[PDB]
């Protein structure tokens, strides 16, 4: 099923639009995902477009080797949503060729490191999707080999990653269409296995549907909708009410749930009935598209769990974020609560605590929890409440 915001309710999407516009003033956040999101729904924003090109030219000319496969995949997707002058950058910089190498590096890392890629399966799916949409060279056998729904990389602990599953579905679906067309040849029976993979992934995605229509959490729903949009083969009308899901998301937007530009970007296309598969590299660019009218303190139980657990009661100003709690604890005791964070596009990411740093190959990371439940937001955004059992936990992907 495909549902979308009616033209009468377009005003409800304004907070998303506003959020993405403010990201112009944030040099730490990406413009690639934002511009991709906008162009996908037929929206062009000059300032953000200029920001993205600047970021792309910067990374290509002096950091291309360090750019992750998934990051390059998004760059290619953003530059080639439709045919324009900026799309030439893909072929002038040979980004598709570079993506093939980065994608192969992910594969060779899994062979060397017990099945763990350099990044993750979300990016791996982004890689296949981009290579598929832009006629890049990739092995379908490699896809059949690694994208099996039972693969551990679809799961973070015991939790199936809806985001990962959704992006995989979008990628696998592209390969399917490419196979049925004349774009790509493969060993006969590949279409069958990929279809089965997709079938299983759709079931796992729908199994994470909440009572309110959300699929996974608030921030995985948008791309989950995309995946379900293109995979109606594997579910009935009574397996999913798209309208309920849409309505719940719209409610979240009005409550400011999508204040993070990365989250706003990822949710937008589906709300307009669009998916990543609507990317037509051979022209869809409508040049005329877009007319825009324009003290109190609180206390929590903060704990750091590794094997043993260190805990204190911290007091912060009301409306403080999870990160503020961590910083207060660090001041109380740098030995025990001292941490290392890095600035990401999503925001502040916790890499190390007590000199103990998260490791990709070890499949280890720091997990944020409240009352034993994993947060849906980062430390920099999660507003804490009185009497909350806040916890940062050393965890595995399992
Ligand atoms: C892989 C993945 C992803 N993750 Co994590 C999950 N699950 N994540 C991870 C892993 C990262 C390491 C790895 N192997 O890459 C992993 C398992 C450790 C992780 C952890 C976290 N994640 C978290 C969450 C909530 C999110 N994650 C997603 C970004 C969720 C993603 C889904 C999505 N994007 O919609 C996701 C599936 C794909 C990210 C990616 O590669 N994108 C493509 C890439 C090209 O862009 P990128 O921006 O460079 O991606 C990098 C960063 O995003 C960073 N990163 C990953 N997650 C976060 C979360 C935050 C808050 C920040 C600031 C950075 C990150 O890791 C990526 C590789 O370096 C999220 C959209 C999933 C969701 N629907 O809830 C959500 C963001 C929501 C929001 N409004 O903030 C955690 C806070 C969960 C928790 N309760 O502990 C936690 C961060 C704790 C900390 N230390 O600060
Ligand atoms: C498809 O999967 C089946 C069952 O695992 C396997 O026997 C077969 O070799 C696969 N076919 C292709 C072309 O991948
Ligand atoms: C544009 O925004 C202004 C804000 O004052 C509003 O009054 C006006 O009705 C809007 N114009 C339309 C209808 O697009
Ligand atoms: C946790 O304890 C185990 C012993 O059971 C130890 O081997 C391991 O190093 C500890 N974990 C960390 C993160 O050091
Ligand atoms: C706070 O966390 C500690 C462990 O870190 C635990 O012993 C204590 O019971 C917690 N406080 C409450 C009331 O939940
Ligand atoms: C935490 O709790 C203790 C005991 O109730 C209290 O005396 C102290 O003021 C609190 N400390 C902080 C930093 O909140
Ligand atoms: C702090 O502010 C929040 C909303 O801003 C409010 O819900 C909460 O009640 C306030 N502090 C109290 C009374 O615990
Ligand atoms: C921090 O807490 C630990 C554990 O109670 C304590 O032994 C140590 O003296 C403290 N370190 C600092 C830097 O205050
Ligand atoms: Ca330190």
Look up the CATH number of the domain holding residue 324.
2.170.130.30
Buried-exposed string 363-387: b where 16+ CB fall within 10 A, e elsewhere: bebbbbbbeeeebebbbbbbebeee
Alpha-carbon span 285 to 67, nearest angstrom: 27
Q: Which two tokens stand for residue 241?
A: 């009410």
Q: Are residues 78 and 162 in the same domain?
A: yes
Q: Tell which of 278, 294, 310 closes a domain.
A: 294
In angstroms, what CA-CA distances link 152 with 74, 91, 147, 282, 374?
24, 35, 10, 36, 19
The single-letter DSSP state of residue 140 is H
Cβ neighbourhood burial of 155 (10 Å; 0-12, 13-18, 19+) = middle
- List the one residue out of 277, 281, 273, 266 whose CA is nearest residue 129: 277
Q: Please indicate if the annotation marks 367 as binding a ligand.
A: yes
Q: Who's near 359: CB < 8 A, 6+ residues apart?
A: none
Taking the centre of ligand 1 as the mean of its atom positions, its distance from the CA of residue 260, in whole angstroms, is 13
- Residue 196 in any domain: the answer is yes
The answer for 66, left when phi > 0, alpha when psi is -120 to 50, beta otherwise, is: alpha
Output the CA 25–ligand 7 centroid distance in Å: 30
> Residue 290's domain is classified under what CATH number?
1.50.10.20
Nearest to 357 by CA among 374, 381, 341: 341
Let me know if residue 3 belongs to a domain. no
Same structural domain for residues 281 and 324?
Answer: no
Is residue 65 one of the residues assigned to a domain? yes
| CB-CB contact of 72 with 136 (8 Å) | no
- Angstrom distance (rounded) from CA 315 to CA 165: 39
Q: Is 278 annotated in some ligand binding site?
A: no
| 368 labelled ligand-binding | yes
Distance 301 CA to ligand 8 centre (A): 18
Residues lining ligand 1, judged by CB closer than 6 Å?
68, 70-71, 74, 119-120, 122-123, 156, 161, 163-164, 216-217, 219-220, 260, 263, 266, 344-350, 360, 365-368, 374-379, 381
Same domain, 183 and 209: yes
- Statement to judge: residues 301 and 280 lie in one domain: no
Distance CA 203, CA 217 (A): 16
Specify whether 289 is located in the same domain as 309.
no
**Burial class (CB within 10 angstroms; exposed 0-12, middle 13-18, buried 19+) of 66:** exposed
Question: Which structural domain range is residue 332 located in?
Answer: 295-398
Q: Does the residue 1 lie in any domain? A: no
Residue 342, beta-bridge partner list: 349
* Domain contains 100: yes
Do 393 and 280 share a structural domain?
Answer: no
- Pocket test residue of 335, 339, 354, 355 for ligand 8, highest count of atoms within 8 A of CB: 335
Helices (H), 63-212: 69-79, 88-92, 95-112, 121-133, 140-146, 162-180, 190-206
User: Which alpha helices (DSSP H) does 135-278 contain, by range?
Assistant: 140-146, 162-180, 190-206, 221-229, 242-254, 261-271
Give the torsion through C-alpha atoms of 27, 294, 262, 388, to 10 deg: 100
Q: Strand 339-343 to strand 348-353: parallel, antiparallel, or no bridges (unpaired)?
A: antiparallel
Give 294: exposed, middle or buried? Use CB within 10 Å, 0-12, 13-18, 19+: exposed
Residue 201 within any structural domain of the chain = yes
Answer yes or no: do 148 and 227 share one domain.
yes
Of the candidates 219, 212, 217, 239, the one whose C-alpha atom is nearest the C-alpha of residue 228 is: 239
Are residues 375 and 263 located together in one domain of the fold?
no
Place of tokens 């910067």: 58
305 phi, psi to nearest 5 deg:
-105, 125
Phi, psi of 303 (to 5 degrees): -130, 145
Residue partners of 22: CB distance under 8 A and separation at least 6: 261
Q: Do the beta carbons of residue 197 and residue 255 sit within 8 Å?
A: no
The number of CA neighbours under 13 Å toward the Cβ of 358 is 21
- Can you read off the two tokens belonging to residue 372? 């034993």
Pair 328, 264 in one domain: no
How many Cβ atoms sit within 10 Å of the Cβ of residue 164? 24
Residues 6+ apart with CB under 8 A from 148: 197
Where do we find the tokens 């009468």? 8
What would the two tokens of residue 352 be? 């190390």
Verify that 336 and 195 share a domain, yes or no: no
Domain boundary among 251, 276, 294: 294
Q: How many CB atoms lie within 10 A of CB 80?
A: 26
Same domain, 252 and 352: no
Maximum distance among all Cα pairs of the chain, rounded to whole angstroms: 68
In a domain, 2, yes or no: no
Of 74, 82, 157, the C-alpha closest to 396 is 157
Method: X-ray
**Token pair for residue 3?**
């549902």
- Collapsing DSSP to helix, strand or coil, 304 comes out as strand
Q: Which residues contact 77 (CB under 8 A, 6 or more apart)?
A: 36, 126, 129, 130, 133, 276, 279
Could you give the 3-state DSSP secondary structure of residue 279?
Answer: coil
SS3 393: strand
Resolution in A: 2.3
In this structure, the residue with its CA closest to atom 11 of ligand 7 is 318
Q: In the block, which residue shows the tokens 């910083």?
A: 327
132 CB within 6 A, ligand 2: no
Q: Does 266 carry a binding-site annotation?
A: yes
115 secondary structure, DSSP code: T
Residue 200 covered by a domain: yes
Query: Is 46 found in the same domain as 183?
Result: yes
* 91 annotated to a ligand binding site: no
Pocket of ligand 7 from Cβ distances under 6 Å: 296, 318-319, 386
Given 294, 321, 342, the domain boundary residue is: 294
Nearest to 313 by CA among 303, 327, 304: 303
- Of the chain, the end-to-end C-alpha distance in Å amounts to 34
Q: State both tokens at 214.
A: 């959300």
Tally the domains of the chain: 2
Closest ligand 8 atom to 332 CA: 14
**CA atoms lying within 13 Å on the CB side of residue 329:** 25
Question: Which SS3 state, helix, strand or coil, does residue 174 take?
Answer: helix
């Amino acid at each position: 099923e495909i549902c979308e915001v009616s033209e009468e309710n377009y005003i409800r999407l304004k907070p998303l639009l506003n959020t993405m516009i403010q990201s112009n003033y944030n040099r730490g956040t990406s413009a690639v995902n934002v511009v991709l999101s906008l162009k996908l729904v037929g929206i062009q924003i000059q300032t953000l477009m200029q920001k993205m090109i600047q970021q792309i030219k910067y990374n290509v000319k002096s950091r291309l080797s360090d750019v992750s496969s998934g990051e390059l995949a998004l760059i290619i997707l953003a530059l080639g949503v439709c045919r324009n002058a900026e799309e030439n950058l893909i072929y002038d910089y040979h980004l598709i060729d570079k993506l093939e190498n980065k994608f192969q590096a992910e594969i060779e890392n899994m062979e060397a490191h017990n099945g763990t890629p350099l990044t993750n399966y979300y990016q791996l799916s982004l890689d296949v999707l981009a290579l598929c949409l832009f006629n890049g060279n990739y092995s379908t056998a490699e896809v059949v080999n690694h994208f099996t729904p039972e693969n551990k990389n679809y799961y973070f602990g015991s939790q199936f990653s809806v985001d990962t599953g959704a992006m995989a579905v979008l990628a696998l679906t592209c390969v399917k269409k490419s196979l049925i067309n004349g774009q790509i040849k493969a060993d006969e029976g590949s279409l069958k296995n990929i279809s089965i993979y997709t079938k299983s992934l759709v079931e796992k995605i729908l199994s994470e549907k909440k009572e309110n229509g959300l699929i996974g959490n608030t921030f995985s729903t948008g791309e989950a909708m995309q995946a379900l949009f293109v995979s109606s083969d594997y579910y009935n009308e009574n397996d999913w009410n798209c309208q309920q899901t849409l309505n719940t998301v719209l409610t979240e937007i009005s409550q400011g749930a999508f204040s993070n530009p990365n989250a706003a970007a990822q949710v937008l296309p589906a709300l307009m009935g669009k998916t990543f598969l609507d990317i037509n590299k051979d022209s869809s660019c409508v040049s005329a598209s877009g007319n825009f009218n324009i003290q109190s303190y609180i206390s929590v139980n903060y704990s750091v769990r590794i094997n043993e657990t260190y805990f204190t009661n911290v007091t912060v100003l009301n409306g403080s974020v999870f990160l503020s709690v961590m910083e207060k604890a660090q001041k109380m005791n740098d030995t025990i609560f001292g941490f290392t964070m890095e600035e990401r596009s999503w925001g502040p990411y916790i890499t190390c605590i007590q000199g103990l740093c998260a490791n990709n190959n070890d499949r280890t990371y720091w997990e944020l929890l409240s009352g034993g439940e994993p947060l849906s937001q980062g430390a920099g955004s999660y507003v804490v409440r009185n009497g909350e059992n806040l916890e940062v936990r050393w965890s595995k992907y399992l």
